Design goal:
It is classed as ribosome. This is part of a larger assembly, with chains A (about 475 residues) and B (about 325 residues). Chain A has about 475 residues and is mainly α. Chain A contains 25 helices and no strands. In chain A, about 35% of the residues are buried. Classes of the chains: A mainly alpha (about 475), B mainly alpha (about 325).
């Protein structure tokens, strides 16, 4: 109504007085934005943006400094309004226009690529100060489901490479200040979402265009950007993390933080500390094992072995891992770690007994995923067939009665020597105990498990079982395969 | 010939809404409509009758046995009368119902679950050949039941009653099949740990809630309540979980576990190994109140099964020459 008329009067325009009046109106709008939060606001923001653009295109102590002061006041008002859907998008567009005008008109000398640091720090402080109830403490998935911060990270931080370096430099400079570092540590879901966006400048598979027309040494040193990212990751992982947040941080460390880290000693120490973490909570008990996969990244990075890695892998396998959605990664890690030629037969037998118990207490998907590992172990280890078939208990038609009597006497005193409570895989006597639990899983309702059991019962034709195709399997996947 | 066919399978009017509105003595009207149709229309009438029966089962069960169970039996007989002549349309309707149930389970965890799903599963088991191993309707229903038993959690008496009804339906469907189900054993272990949560012996069972329990306050004598199968009535009154109701649910779960052990798990010696902790949990029941009679009988049956089994070995993989 009146806002549109004011915008039209400002656009039609003694133009300095009109611009000052428009700035005052924008300030009044930003002041009443609190009550607004408690269509005209978007129009006022658009009018303010248009006035700022006109002032930047025209003006450059009462003609140059006055316009600059008005622009700074408008920017501060916008930052205060953003800190305290359509309004957020309008504020983001106004901030982008102000950044473009600062990089294009606020420079003293034309030709030198310079970017503002006070305005960027003020915008970062205004964006980081905003906190919502539905953003932090994500229960289903993610770390921070924001509306303005996520849109800015996906539309502006994911499109420019110099913007990411500028944000890293602003966070490193803000880490020296105690209040800004405390604000960054309190809002750790925003940094987690920025890291999980996977749009950093260190990634070579994706290229980002230059936001400003003149890049201010954006590719001068990637080592400085890597060091800033490592410092930000070290400062943001000091504390104030939930169990789901810790699991997300471990997944990011094993997925897309180790490749962006300059010094991996701190990351390896954090992964080793998290892999040994265990509490009475049932949710956190599987939090360390995936972090152990990050320790496997250390096994692919440094020549440092974890203490009792085989014992930790044996004690980390439980029914909670088979009932979790991250069972595929744990199964892949167990299959990869068992591919070494230095593994003994007692540890292999104990792992086979543990997998048999896990398949005895799980759904059909976990048993189908673990059947290929057992088949690969039987193909690779010929002694494991001794756990499958016992020739001393066999009977032949062309045999003497004394041998049959001895076999009957041996079978009459047959016991199970395997110990399930024994954490040491070598000390577990699963080699002398038969794998009876495989026979209990043969009679299953699903036909794929029955086909896998029938293939395992017969002789092995090919060594490569192609376990990658039968790795991702669930109830919905099995239902879709059966129905289609 | 029918037994041989079962063994071989083991080894190897228009709109539904309009019909439901017209029905809302419905069984007699449905029978009259079916007779008038029989005097694609028959398949549409059968689908509409099945939808009306499912709506009546999942809507309310406030009427008694002689007022609601008689009408349900009449509707089931009317549906089974056209089930022998129409099987492809019935299989397509069962597949569509299974897909709708899967979509409801994917959309909501327990809010989209209704009390008519158990009745629909029982009707599908009764109508179709339950002895069939690979079937277009039986296999998907069993897979969906196993997924619901292994994916859902227990936090109230309604979840425990639904799990007991699902275990009973799985035992009835596998009464002729006699197949081993690790999901059923896992559900029984979870029900035993949830009623004994009130613990340190079983830590990998991953119990959902520790708020559920079973105190030693019920006599569990011969005057105790029976199973009394009424899914709507039990689920709608499970907010007030009584000691008598929880004791009846625990006794029904123990009886179902004993029936599955003596009818399905008695043919596997390795299941005795799978009965190593659970009977110990029953021994924990023997250490819980030391007054129940079903736990002592279950322990005696487990001991007899362990003593009868030799627990030796079983292998094969042989070969020879050729012609």
């Amino acid at each position: 109504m009146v806002l549109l008329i004011s915008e039209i009067k400002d656009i039609a325009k003694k133009q300095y007085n009109s611009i000052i009046k428009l700035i005052n109106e924008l300030v009044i709008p930003e002041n009443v934005t609190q009550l607004e939060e408690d269509f005209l606001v978007m129009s006022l923001f658009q009018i303010f943006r248009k006035l700022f653009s006109r002032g930047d295109l025209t003006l450059p102590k009462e003609q140059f400094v006055n316009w600059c002061r008005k622009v700074y006041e408008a920017f501060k008002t916008k930052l205060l309004a953003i800190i305290s859907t359509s309004l957020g998008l309008d504020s983001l567009d106004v901030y982008l226009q102000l950044a473009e005008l600062e990089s294009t008109h606020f420079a003293s000398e034309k030709g030198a690529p310079f970017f503002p640091n006070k305005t960027f720090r003020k915008l970062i402080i205004a964006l980081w100060s905003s906190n919502m109830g539905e953003i932090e403490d994500v229960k289903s998935s993610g770390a921070s489901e924001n509306l303005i911060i996520v849109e800015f990270t996906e539309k502006y931080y994911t499109k420019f490479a110099d913007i990411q370096y500028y944000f890293q430099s602003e966070f490193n400079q803000l880490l020296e200040d105690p209040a800004y570092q405390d604000l960054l540590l309190k809002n750790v879901g925003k940094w987690l979402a920025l890291v999980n966006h996977d749009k950093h400048c260190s990634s070579v598979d994706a290229d980002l265009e230059i936001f400003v027309p003149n890049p201010p040494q954006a590719i001068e040193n990637e080592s400085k950007f890597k060091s800033n990212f490592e410092k930000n990751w070290l400062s943001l992982l000091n504390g104030q993390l939930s169990l789901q947040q810790y699991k997300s941080i471990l997944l990011i460390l094993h997925k897309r933080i180790i490749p962006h880290f300059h010094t991996p000693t701190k990351l390896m120490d954090f992964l080793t500390d998290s892999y040994n973490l265990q509490s009475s909570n049932k949710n956190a008990g599987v939090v360390p094992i995936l972090a152990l996969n990050g320790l496997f990244e250390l096994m692919k990075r440094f020549n440092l072995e974890y203490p009792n890695f085989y014992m930790k892998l044996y004690q980390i396998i439980n029914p909670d891992l088979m009932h979790v959605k991250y069972r595929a990664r744990f199964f892949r890690l167990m299959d990869v770690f068992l591919s070494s030629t230095h593994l003994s037969a007692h540890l292999v037998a104990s792992f086979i007994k543990k997998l048999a118990r896990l398949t005895l207490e799980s759904p059909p998907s976990a048993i189908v995923t673990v059947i290929p590992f057992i088949y690969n172990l039987i193909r690779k280890h010929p002694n494991c067939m001794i756990m499958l078939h016992n020739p001393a208990f066999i009977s032949n038609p062309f045999q003497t009665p004394d041998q049959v009597a001895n076999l009957k006497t041996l079978k009459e005193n047959y016991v199970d020597p395997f110990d399930v409570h024994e954490s040491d895989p070598e000390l577990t006597h699963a080699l002398d105990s038969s794998l009876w639990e495989l026979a209990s899983l043969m009679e299953h309702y699903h036909p794929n498990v029955a086909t896998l059991a029938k293939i395992f019962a017969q002789p092995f034709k090919k060594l490569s079982y192609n376990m990658e195709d039968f790795l991702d399997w669930n109830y919905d996947s099995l239902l879709n395969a059966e129905s289609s | 010939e029918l037994e041989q066919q079962r063994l071989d399978r083991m080894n190897g009017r228009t709109h539904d809404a309009l019909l439901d509105q017209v029905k809302k003595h419905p069984k007699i009207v449905k029978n009259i409509i079916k007779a008038y149709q029989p005097k694609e229309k028959l398949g549409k009438f059968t689908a509409v009758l099945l939808r009306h029966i499912i709506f009546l089962s999942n809507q309310n069960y406030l009427k008694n046995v002689q007022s609601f169970k008689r009408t349900q039996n009449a509707l089931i007989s009317i549906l089974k009368s056209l089930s022998e002549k129409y099987n492809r349309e019935l299989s397509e309707e069962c597949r569509d119902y299974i897909n709708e149930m899967q979509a409801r389970y994917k959309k909501n965890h327990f809010d989209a679950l209704s009390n008519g799903d158990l009745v629909f599963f029982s009707i599908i088991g009764i109508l179709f050949s339950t002895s069939d191993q690979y079937h277009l309707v039986i296999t998907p229903a069993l897979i969906l039941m196993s997924q619901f038993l292994e994916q859902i959690k227990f936090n109230s008496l309604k979840r425990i009653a639904f799990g007991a009804v699902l275990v009973r339906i799985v035992s009835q469907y596998q009464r002729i099949s006699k197949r081993y189900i690790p999901e059923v054993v896992y559900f029984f272990q979870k029900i035993l740990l949830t009623f004994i949560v009130e613990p340190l012996d079983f830590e990998n069972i991953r119990l959902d809630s520790y708020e559920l329990g079973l105190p030693l306050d019920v006599d569990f004598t011969k005057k105790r309540s029976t199973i009394i199968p009424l899914h709507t009535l039990s689920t709608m009154d499970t907010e007030a979980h009584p000691v008598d109701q929880c004791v009846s649910v625990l006794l029904n779960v123990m009886e179902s576990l004993d029936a599955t052990i003596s009818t399905v798990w008695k043919s596997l010696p390795a299941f005795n190994e799978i009965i190593l902790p659970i009977q110990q949990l029953l021994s924990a029941y023997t250490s819980k109140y030391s007054d129940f009679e079903k736990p002592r009988n279950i322990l005696n049956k487990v001991e007899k099964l362990t003593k009868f089994t030799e627990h030796i070995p079983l292998a094969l993989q042989n070969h020879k020459p050729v012609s």
